[PDB]
Amino acid sequence: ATTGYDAVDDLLHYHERGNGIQINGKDSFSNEQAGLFITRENQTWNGYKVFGQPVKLTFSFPDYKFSSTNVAGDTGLSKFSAEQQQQAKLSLQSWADVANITFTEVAAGQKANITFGNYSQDRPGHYDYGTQAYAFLPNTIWQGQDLGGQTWYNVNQSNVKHPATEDYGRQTFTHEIGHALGLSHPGDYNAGEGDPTYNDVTYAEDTRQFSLMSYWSETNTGGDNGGHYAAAPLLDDIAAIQHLYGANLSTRTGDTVYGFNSNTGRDFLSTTSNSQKVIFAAWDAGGNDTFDFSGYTANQRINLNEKSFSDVGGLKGNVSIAAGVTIENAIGGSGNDVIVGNAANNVLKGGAGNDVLFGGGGADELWGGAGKDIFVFSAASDSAPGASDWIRDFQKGIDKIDLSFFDKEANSSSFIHFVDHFSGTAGEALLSYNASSNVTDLSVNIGGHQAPDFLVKIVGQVDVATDFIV
Ligand SMILES: [Ca+2]
Ligand SMILES: [Ca+2]
Ligand SMILES: [Ca+2]
Ligand SMILES: [Ca+2]
Ligand SMILES: [Ca+2]
Ligand SMILES: [Ca+2]
Ligand SMILES: [Ca+2]
Ligand SMILES: [Zn+2]
C-alpha cells in the first residue's frame, strides 16, 4: 500500500515532540517547553522575572581603541566595519520582527543598551585564532557596573569580518544578540568550558534545526541545511523571545508571499533562484499568505500546519511555521511534492511533477498542475457540502482521487463503493458528470446520514474505472 495518504500521514508526523516522547535517548520538549528552558535564567531588560512586556532598546557601534582592553581582558579592539554594521542591523530587525522590541541606534559616544565591538588579541601583541564571540545577558553586574548588552566578536575569523558572504557570520550576530536580549543556550554548556557535545543536551531538540542558540548540528535531529546556517530566529527561539517580550502582532499583517516572488523585504525569507536556499521559521500576524516555492526543482514536502516542518529547496526540515500563525496557500516546484494544508481555506498548487495534495478542513482549491497528481481526502469535513473543495485541473486517466483512508480504517474492501443512486447506506459514493459545464460532482455518504456528508467539485471528467485509489 504506497498511497497518497501514506505520504500525507508521514509528513503530518514529521518531528513530533513533547508529551513524554524520547529521541536520541533524550527527553523531547514541546515548542513551549523549549522556549521556557532557553530563558531559564529569567533575566530580561524589563527586570528579573518580568515577562511579556515590550521593551525599547538603544544600540551603537562604539569607536574602540586598539590598545584598549575590554572587561573580559581581550584587546586589539576595533569598531565594526560598514559591512558588519549592516548585517548586525539585519540581525537586530529579525528579532524585532517577532517580539515587541524596538531598537534605536545612538551615536558611538552615547550610552547604549546593546553594543557591538571587534577584538583580535587575547593578550597584548598576541592574536587569538581560537575564539568566536561572546556576550553578556541583561543585568550582568560586576563591581557595580552593568555589563549586559555588550557583544564582542573575534575579527580574525573570516565569517565575523565578512558576515554578508559567510552565513555563519550573520548567524553569530543573531546568536550573540539573542544572549544580549536574555536567551541562554538551550543546554548547560559554553565554549571554553570542558568538552561538551550533543550527547550533553538536556532535551532532544537542542539543535540548529530548532534554535540558533544551539551549538549542535541540525543533522542530530534529522535536519539537513546543506552546509548553510539560518540567519534569523528559529522555531524555539521565537517561543523564547516572545515569552520575554511578547509576540509582535504588527508584523506582516498584509497578504505576504514567502520564498520566490516574496514581498517580505527580508533576505532570509526570500529567494530569486533554485541555487539560493531558504532556511526560516515564519512569524506572520495576519492576512492571506503564501509559501511560494515554485522555482525549486527538488522534491519538496510542504506542511502549512503551525509548529510543523517542511522540506524545501533540496534541504530537509529547513522551513517551519511558528505557533499561532496561519499560512494559507502553497505552491510546489517542478519536483514531485507533498503539500499538506490546514483547517483554513487553502489554495494548493503542485506545479509540474507528480504531486500529492491534501487540503484538510475548510474550502480548498486544488491544482495538480502538470504530471500525475493525487488528491487525498480522509474525513467528511475535508469537503463538507456548503464548503466544498474544488479540484480545478483534473485530467481523467492521469490524476487520481485517493479515498484509501476510509476502507483501511474500516478494514473492509466494500465500505466505500460506487453506486448509481443513494440508498442511505453509509459508504455509498456517487459521481455526477455535467458535460455542459465540464464539472463532475463526487458525493459520498460517510456517516450514513439522510444526505451525503462529503462533496467534492471537480473541473473535468473523472473515470471511475481508473481514477480512484480506494
Ligand atoms: Ca501576512
Ligand atoms: Ca495568514
Ligand atoms: Ca511539483
Ligand atoms: Ca503536478
Ligand atoms: Ca478542505
Ligand atoms: Ca484546508
Ligand atoms: Ca496533474
Ligand atoms: Zn552563545
Swiss-Prot record:
Its EC number is 3.4.24.40. It comes from the Bacteria. Ca(2+) 6 binds at residues 360, 362, 364, 382, 389. Ca(2+) 7 binds at residues 369, 371, 373, 399. Ca(2+) 5 binds at residues 351, 353, 355, 368, 370, 373. It is an enzyme of class 3 (hydrolase). Zn(2+) binds at residues 175, 179, 185, 215. The active site is at residue 176. It catalyses: Preferential cleavage of bonds with hydrophobic residues in P1'. Ca(2+) 3 binds at residues 333, 335, 337, 350, 352, 355. The keyword Hydrolase applies. Binds 7 Ca(2+) ions per subunit. Binds 1 zinc ion per subunit. Keywords: Calcium, Hydrolase, Metal-binding, Metalloprotease, Protease, Repeat, Secreted, Toxin, Virulence, Zinc, Zymogen. Ca(2+) 1 binds at residues 252, 254, 256, 284, 286, 289. Pfam families: HemolysinCabind, Peptidase_M10, Peptidase_M10_C. Its cofactor is Ca(2+); Zn(2+). Hemolysin-type calcium-binding repeats lie at residues 331-348, 349-366. GO terms for cellular component: extracellular matrix; extracellular region; extracellular space. InterPro entries: Hemolysin-typ_Ca-bd_CS, Hemolysn_Ca-bd, MetalloPept_cat_dom_sf, Pept_M10_metallopeptidase, Pept_M10B, Peptidase_M10B_C, Peptidase_Metallo, Serralysin-like. PANTHER family: MATRIX METALLOPROTEINASE, MATRIX METALLOPROTEINASE-21. The Gly-rich repeats may be important in the extracellular secretion of this metalloprotease. Belongs to the peptidase M10B family. Has insecticidal activity against the locust M.palpalis. When administered orally to locusts at a low dose it causes them to lie on their sides exhibiting sporadic limb movements and muscular twitching, followed by full recovery. When administered at higher doses the same symptoms are observed, followed by death. This is Serralysin.
